[PDB]
Structure 1
Amino acid sequence: ESTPIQQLLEHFLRQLQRKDPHGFFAFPVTDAIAPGYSMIIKHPMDFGTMKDKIVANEYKSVTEFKADFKLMCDNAMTYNRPDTVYYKLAKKILHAGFKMMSKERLLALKRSMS
């Protein structure tokens, strides 16, 4: 059993995960691979956690989905230094999400949806 909003969020999540072929954003970061992570980053987030929330119908809106997506990217831009692959990939993914899920793009989706 699924709903229109779950199918829409699954589509955005799939498109964003395509930009992360190696799965750096696929599951939670552990301190063993990222020293000090859990001290620096107080509110972890990852694409696997977001998928689970979609399945449990925990997002009321695209705005709520975007807030978890932005948190994930911000954590990576805060913890990692700028010359690292994780910092650079976080910027690429976040730029893609801004364009995919902007207020303007959603407006048009709604009108067509009416």
Structure 2
Amino acid sequence: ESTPIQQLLEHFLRQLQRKDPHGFFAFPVTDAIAPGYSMIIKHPMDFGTMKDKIVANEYKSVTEFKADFKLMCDNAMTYNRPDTVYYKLAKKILHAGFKMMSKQAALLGNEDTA
């Protein structure tokens, strides 16, 4: 009883979460472990929240899903300093994670891999 967009975003979410083996983006960030986050980050986002929107069919497109992934990465680079594991990890997986999802859609339009 699954949905085509569900199965595709479960695949994408799996691929990206492998680039965070310690789960720094697995759960919503709380002020207990990040003082002031509630006040500096107006729209928080995490891998766990994206999974719930997948399960609840709240994504109508791949673009909506990519916006939540970028916002989660952008939040981590706003609230944290550049010399932090959170900034470095969020910078690497944001980029590596966009190309990864772009090269999989791109091979369907290329004459050699279609």
Same fold by TM (over 0.5)? yes
Q: Which moved more, 1:12-21 or 1:104-113?
A: 104-113
- What corresponds to 2:44 in structure 1? 44
Greater helix fraction, Structure 1 or Structure 2? 1
SS at match of 2:7: helix
CA RMSD of aligned residues (A): 2.5
- State the alpha-carbon separation in 1 of the partners of residues 77 and 34 from structure 2: 13
Deviation of the 1:102 alpha carbon: 2.8
Deviation of the 1:42 alpha carbon: 0.3
Change (3 A) 1:110 1:8: farther
Deviation of the 1:104 alpha carbon: 8.2
- State the alpha-carbon separation in 1 of the partners of residues 38 and 109 from structure 2: 38
SS at match of 2:111: helix
SS at match of 1:110: coil
- State the alpha-carbon separation in 1 of the partners of residues 98 and 14 from structure 2: 15
Deviation of the 1:106 alpha carbon: 4.9
SS at match of 1:39: helix
1:34-93 Cα distance to aligned partner (Å, 9 max, x none): 111111000000000000000001100001100110100000010000000000000111
Deviation of the 1:101 alpha carbon: 2.5
- State the alpha-carbon separation in 1 of the partners of residues 46 and 10 from structure 2: 14
Deviation of the 1:98 alpha carbon: 1.6
User: Where do 5+ consecutive residues of structure 2 fail to align?
Assistant: none
Deviation of the 1:113 alpha carbon: 12
Query: Any conservation in 1 of the 2:107–2:113 contact (CA below 8 Å)?
Result: no
- State the alpha-carbon separation in 1 of the partners of residues 14 and 8 from structure 2: 10
- State the alpha-carbon separation in 1 of the partners of residues 108 and 94 from structure 2: 21
Deviation of the 1:21 alpha carbon: 0.7
Deviation of the 1:3 alpha carbon: 1.4
